[PDB]
Symmetry: D3
Subunit: 167 residues, 6 copies
């Protein structure tokens, strides 16, 4: 039983970790696709796919989740939404269920015949990429929104200095 | 200490496994990029990136190599060789050394300032994607050239029927 | 005498039908290019090119316009506006006049040396893709804005459920 | 009942016409996709998609086949074969059966769950794009291989002068 | 000693000329990249790369700056910001310093290890592409913001008629 | 009076220099487009566009040709030959005549309505990119085929070591 979760992870936050843990209770393995893998250095998409791979890797490992239970696969975006589900299938192992709170992702997989689950949102008011990046820019408390390992990655790659300069 | 290995893995064979094991003796983790992730269903590139991810995953796991010791990242090809090293960096975790027997890959990383190691070839006369695919097409003994787990993947996805039809 | 009409047809409405009929009174055949053929599943561009081909086909046929009097050709968008006129020429039969109310389309063809006609707008306050899609989303009366055959196509492909989910 | 036929039509020849007529005896409408719509001015792909649209249109009309019985849709090629079937679906009306003698096309649609029919070849030794273009270049008898209407199109667009210059 | 300046030059204005002159006092040659070379015919990017090449050429020549002191190189934009610095390097001669007031350009080159200088802004309230284009559209005094040679180019290519039609 | 010359310049050789000098006797300025600006690090296309810009610049300057008499513009290739002439126009200043010995280039510009001149070939048996690169690889005398300034550029960028490694 393999599930699929897709997200920009800009950056990977506590909401992401929580949903992943719950998902791992109903599936044997979880395919985690880092979408928009081609975007980086913008206010909405500051981190490269590689930096995000490290964020995910450290965070999951830090939380004791065995690496054998998940796949981290960067996925560049494409121009045709009608071909995106096929695009994901082509780059990933086979999967039985799709977990997503993103309307577009839900509708695309739904139309393709996949069962789509929308997990309950975990503190959607604070655990969102938008809030995290807003706090980084306005000097708010973004650190509490992310697993400690992610904060370390961001510090190491000078993530805040980057996003502030770009803004 | 993290190394980087790039290959089409069309399909993943015993030569690949051997070089990976030796590399894992000098580095802590190995980033394994599956190149030409956009190509599939052709005589030279029959398998999708996703099918190759499964081949690698099963094979490495079958050989007792812990998943925490490697990263499997599909990498689509790009038009400009001059930007390829940057392309790889953008999609991967940081790495210290590059292992490759491919002249182009060696020269590109070399010009970029990376130390490149060309591991000794393991039975280059039989352990090559070209030979494997040739045997699949001419009904030769391709199975002995691949780890058992890879053969199982190919059987499951009807790899031989596909490549034969395409030829 | 062949004319050219380009439009997103998202979806094909009564305004489109009316302008086509009038155009067919001054030209022998009309080339109808469905622009942005690569876009689908978005609030501004909900339908695939194929679904739009059916909308046009059924509507024109429903209105007794012989198929021998027009060409339905999907045209993907391209990055360079400076090459778009050439892009259209490359995918279509030769044409003598261009009919369009779109400023960009008018200027591009004009600069290329083509005579461009801007037909009078037919109820521009209700007959527009924007209004149709707005009514579909807010449960307004979108059906009256489209030929009956188009409504049937939309019902069949669950167009409203799609656009509502995406919103 | 709608069928699908895909071909480069470089140029449209008597073999194409014959297979289309037979297909039209088992389906109500035939979707005819002109593949490699982006290629032109090369020895293997001399004609633009638009020129080919005219070739098909004139030929089918010349042979009394009603325009309401077919769709002529140019389809640009894409880099990922794994997404091509989806690419075709996205640009076309729905279809029940696929007719093709091309191994790749057959395997792709087959893997996607479509029934694929390989019509008998009509004089494959003379009725092929390769032979036609070879005769045009070596001053052989290419005219007898094409419907008269197609020859007229080629004469009008100076097709032979083009291909000879390119060679 | 060679410097690098990148800009859309939509259109080339007095601010551009001033910064170039000052830069030419600290470097032997200046590489001038016209960014977004693929965009044209839009309100934000009205002129083609070729038209901009003429604007730069005439203006610099008009101001007595020898052609041997600079390189005018059109550079199309790319999807990955992470590869852009590499993209520029690939299309240009080697350079020692980068001059730019654009935050993104500064951060990208900075992260790549280049020294980046942000020249003082020359009348930023009037000397900006945005103001120039705004005046062209609202019939303001755009001519005083540009070198005379640039105005002549714009008049010759009917730049104002174009941008007004597009708006 | 402005002419246009397009070439890969892989690398710029004595034949190129000779044709340019003769052309400069009938035109006031010469636009020199370095085609395939996106290709580098391959046996057929070893040098980046930037390296070629330097080769041209040094060679022309070395031969006393004033920089004000020419434009060096890198041009990436595109997928549609039917749009290439438009692609060139978009990136360059206006031109009156096209000089080329390349059949494709000649036919494309010819069909677009341009007068195309095919200058006499200068020692075509030795002055060709193919011969130069062949000698570099087989240790033949490639230096005599290129202007001295070009040899210096190649030495400086380790061009021979690169092409030999790639082979
Ligand atoms: N055509 C295309 O190229 C195309 C089409 C669709 C989607 N995409 C890609 O999909 C990606 C979008 O992913 P996204 O917007 O979902 O990214 P995201 O990082 O914001 O969200 C990832 C997922 O995590 C979960 N999640 C997020 N916050 C949560 C919280 N607080 N509590 C619980 N669960 C939470 C949701 O399932 C969500 O979908 C992008 O890369 C986009 O480009 C591409
Ligand atoms: N511009 C670009 O897009 C660009 C530039 C360079 C390379 N690439 C990509 O790089 C990939 C090519 O990888 P490849 O040709 O090396 O693939 P491969 O699967 O044939 O080889 C993978 C690697 O495995 C090792 N190996 C193979 N056989 C072995 C044996 N018998 N014994 C020991 N070691 C062995 C070598 O290090 C080799 O490089 C492609 O996807 C290519 O497109 C892309
Ligand atoms: N570079 C590029 O890729 C490029 C450049 C220009 C245009 N395009 C494409 O052109 C398409 C845009 O077409 P559009 O905006 O005109 O689509 P549309 O469907 O809104 O309008 C189609 C045409 O129908 C007519 N029309 C619409 N409503 C009417 C009414 N009520 N009464 C009478 N006539 C009416 C007008 O002539 C109009 O231009 C897009 O696909 C766009 O991407 C592409
Ligand atoms: N990834 C991709 O972009 C991708 C993948 C697959 C195919 N394609 C496209 O498919 C197209 C290829 O079409 P093709 O090679 O079949 O073109 P074609 O014109 O040679 O043949 C068209 C079809 O006509 C029929 N036919 C041809 N000669 C005949 C004869 N003498 N008698 C009877 N029937 C005959 C066959 O069914 C054949 O497949 C190309 O445009 C190719 O690029 C694209
Ligand atoms: N990924 C990518 O494709 C990518 C990433 C970064 C940048 N770019 C490209 O970079 C280009 C952007 O250039 P831009 O925004 O700087 O263009 P611009 O023409 O507005 O400015 C050009 C430069 O001129 C100088 N300048 C402008 N006005 C001045 C004034 N009044 N006084 C003094 N100096 C002045 C500044 O150094 C400025 O950066 C675009 O083509 C963009 O697409 C591309
Ligand atoms: N669709 C497209 O992207 C498309 C279409 C056509 C051409 N192109 C581009 O055009 C470029 C090809 O240029 P090319 O093949 O001519 O390059 P080249 O460097 O071999 O030749 C350049 C030109 O120099 C002249 N020349 C060469 N050797 C000479 C000699 N010994 N004596 C006298 N004159 C001599 C000829 O006019 C020749 O065309 C490529 O970059 C190609 O990709 C692109």
């Amino acid at each position: 039983m393999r599930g699929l979760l897709v997200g920009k992870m800009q950056p990977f936050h506590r909401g992401h970790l929580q949903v992943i843990k719950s998902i791992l209770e109903e599936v044997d393995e979880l395919i985690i696709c880092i979408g928009s893998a081609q975007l980086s250095h913008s206010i909405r998409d500051p981190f490269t796919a590689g930096e995000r791979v490290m964020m995910l890797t450290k965070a999951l490992s830090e939380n004791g989740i065995p690496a054998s239970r998940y796949y981290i696969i960067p996925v560049q975006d494409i121009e045709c939404n009608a071909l995106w589900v096929g695009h994901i299938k082509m780059l990933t192992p086979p999967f039985d269920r799709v977990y997503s709170g993103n309307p577009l992702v839900q509708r695309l997989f739904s139309e393709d015949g996949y069962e789509v689950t929308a997990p309950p949102l975990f503190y959607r008011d604070r655990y969102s990429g938008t809030e995290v990046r807003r706090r980084m820019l306005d000097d708010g408390d973004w650190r509490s929104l992310l697993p400690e390992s992610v904060v370390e990655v961001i510090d190491e790659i000078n993530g805040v200095e980057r996003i502030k300069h770009l803004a």
